[PDB]
């Protein structure tokens, strides 16, 4: 089997190029949920789901967008022509920066929503409760 390692490396390299490009992370989209029972709790998961911060993202996006609307009202006819003025170029750069930060907030909001939606089928608290050895302690345990 030592002589076959080169063949294995070649085949894996051939397949990885196609494998990596067009795949969707099922873990990111919470389609895989069998590991969550090990490190997550039911009430904690539901509290995190209730405590999501979508509203703050939406309100900040709207605030930035209305600031951009005011800036566009002040600027007037925006254009991407070659720049010959410091004022015009600076205002255009500010506009593009604000659009970029709006997009960043939107993407962060989606990521946070997907990350806080994670839940376990059985919380580790449920596993502990169903596994606990009733009320038996070492006080009445048999040494024999």
């Amino acid at each position: 089997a030592s002589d076959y390692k080169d063949v294995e490396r070649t085949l894996l390299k051939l397949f990885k190029k196609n494998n990596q490009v067009n795949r969707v992370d099922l873990d990111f989209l919470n389609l895989v949920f069998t590991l969550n029972d090990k490190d997550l709790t039911s009430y904690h998961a539901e509290e995190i789901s209730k405590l999501t911060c979508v509203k703050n993202f939406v309100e900040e996006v709207n605030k930035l967008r209305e600031t951009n609307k005011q800036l566009q009202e002040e600027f007037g006819e925006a254009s991407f022509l070659n720049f010959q003025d410091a004022n015009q170029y600076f205002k255009y750069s500010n506009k593009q920066k604000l659009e970029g930060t709006v997009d960043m907030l939107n993407f962060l909001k989606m990521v946070n929503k997907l990350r806080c939606d994670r839940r376990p089928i059985f919380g580790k608290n449920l596993i502990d409760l169903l596994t606990k050895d009733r009320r038996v302690k070492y006080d009445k345990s048999s040494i024999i």
């Binding site: 069998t34 509290e47 405590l51 911060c53 703050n56 990521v111 449920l126 169903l130």
Partner: protein, 441 residues
């Protein structure tokens, strides 16, 4: 639930009145008044929850509403009452014995509603101050939307905080019983601080209300789930993989004792359910002998059985039986019978199916479908409805008519015409002896 229009998609439940009197058509069911009364009596028996381990047999000709009656019972039961519907052939496994498969099916049909009491403190940590030489001491501040309090931290609490690496702006939860610290997430004010975020990070709001809260939560767990969890060290994975093996009998006895203790202490409630076995005639004599004793248990559920065979041969034996089932099992079973439908009932069923499939039938097409159903079969016309709809749509006509149904009848055969054609040309189809004339000239 993710679903498409299916065979029994129109049954919302048994159309029973307050006095368990069936309506002529209600909740998607037509006719079978006596059978629906019996099903309602069984349903009320399940709902009462006192009677344990009763076997019900549903008998009648094929396509007469047996599985429809079971679906109606399941819909009337609703959620919070377990209902495990399995086939006769499902119990045969290469990993589990037949008795183990039946035991797991029985335990799946009983649910345990367990209450766990948790006391927690949740809030966004505002400031942390730790002094260390001797043992360390420190003070910590946690705020809510309408409260703020400073707490003093012990040495072990400080050790836990350090091993969790908690910083300001983090929303954390502490169980005052054990002192375990769980990091819910970060505040929104820290979101701007980075361009890319790690996998662990989450942004959450500050919790409202009082800092310290008491809450009780009810969990619905079947007996089988408790057995699997308490069998191995990671049985909850077997609850999904199915590689559970034959659970020890002593484990089941321990779980029964534990559930009894919980029920006495009042933290667990028993919600018995219905086990439905489709095509029970595919079971073996060993399975029936196990079922006979399984029903004689305090935790045994109510078993519904649907069979259509008359005097047939029980599997695993060399003799015939009244329903394909041994006399001992029939002795401990009450029988609900079904009756063949007349023309009007078939017409109403076809109308309901057409409505569910959003197909606009015409009166003449409905009459033709009813005639084909009474002549050949109900399922044949029910399946012809959608094919006729597709043919009509291909004809750029939004309603189905007699021509579309006639074309559907011509294209797609039924059992009788197929038998006639196979008998007329026996030489071109393979027989039991294997002879076939592929040649034509």
């Amino acid at each position: 639930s993710l679903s498409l229009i299916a065979a029994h998609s129109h049954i919302t439940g048994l159309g029973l009145d307050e006095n368990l009197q069936p309506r002529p058509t209600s909740e998607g069911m037509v006719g079978q008044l006596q059978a629906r009364r019996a099903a309602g009596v069984i349903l009320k028996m399940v709902q009462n929850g006192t009677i344990a381990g009763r076997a019900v047999l549903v008998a009648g000709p094929p396509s007469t509403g047996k599985t429809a009656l079971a679906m109606g019972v399941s819909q009337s039961l609703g959620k919070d009452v377990p209902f495990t519907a399995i086939a006769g052939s499902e119990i045969f496994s290469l990993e589990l014995s037949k008795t183990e498969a039946l035991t797991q099916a029985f335990r799946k049909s009983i649910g345990i509603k367990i209450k766990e009491e948790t006391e927690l403190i949740e809030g966004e940590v505002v400031e942390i101050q730790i002094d260390r030489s001797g043992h360390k001491q420190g003070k910590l501040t946690i705020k809510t939307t309408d409260m703020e309090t400073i707490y003093e931290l012990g040495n072990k609490m400080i050790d836990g905080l350090t091993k969790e690496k908690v910083l300001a702006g983090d929303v954390i939860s502490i169980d005052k019983a054990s002192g375990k610290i769980t990091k819910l997430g970060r505040s929104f004010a820290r979101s701007r601080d980075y361009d890319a975020m790690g996998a662990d990070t989450r942004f959450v709001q500050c919790p409202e209300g009082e800092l310290q809260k008491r809450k009780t939560v009810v969990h619905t767990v079947s007996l089988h789930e408790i057995d699997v969890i308490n069998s191995r060290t990671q049985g909850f994975l077997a609850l999904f993989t199915g590689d559970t093996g034959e659970i020890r009998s002593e484990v089941r006895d321990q779980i029964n004792t534990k559930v009894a203790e919980w029920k006495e202490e009042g933290k667990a409630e028993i919600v018995p359910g219905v086990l439905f076995i489709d095509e029970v005639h595919m079971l073996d004599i060993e399975c029936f002998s196990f079922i006979n004793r399984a029903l004689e248990d305090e935790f045994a559920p109510i078993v519904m059985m649907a069979t259509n065979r008359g005097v047939s041969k029980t599997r695993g034996t060399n003799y015939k039986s009244p329903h394909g089932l041994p006399l001992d099992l029939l002795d401990r079973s009450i029988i609900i019978t079904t009756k063949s439908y007349n023309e009007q009932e078939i017409k109403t069923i076809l109308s309901i199916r057409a409505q569910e499939e959003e197909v606009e039938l015409s009166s003449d097409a409905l009459d033709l479908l009813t005639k084909t159903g009474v002549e050949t079969s109900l399922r044949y016309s029910s399946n012809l409805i959608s094919v006729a709809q597709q043919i009509a749509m291909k004809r750029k006509n939004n309603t189905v008519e007699v021509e579309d149904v006639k074309r559907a009848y011509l294209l797609f055969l039924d059992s009788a015409r197929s038998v006639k054609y196979v008998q007329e040309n026996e030489s071109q189809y393979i027989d039991d002896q294997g002879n076939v004339q592929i040649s034509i000239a």
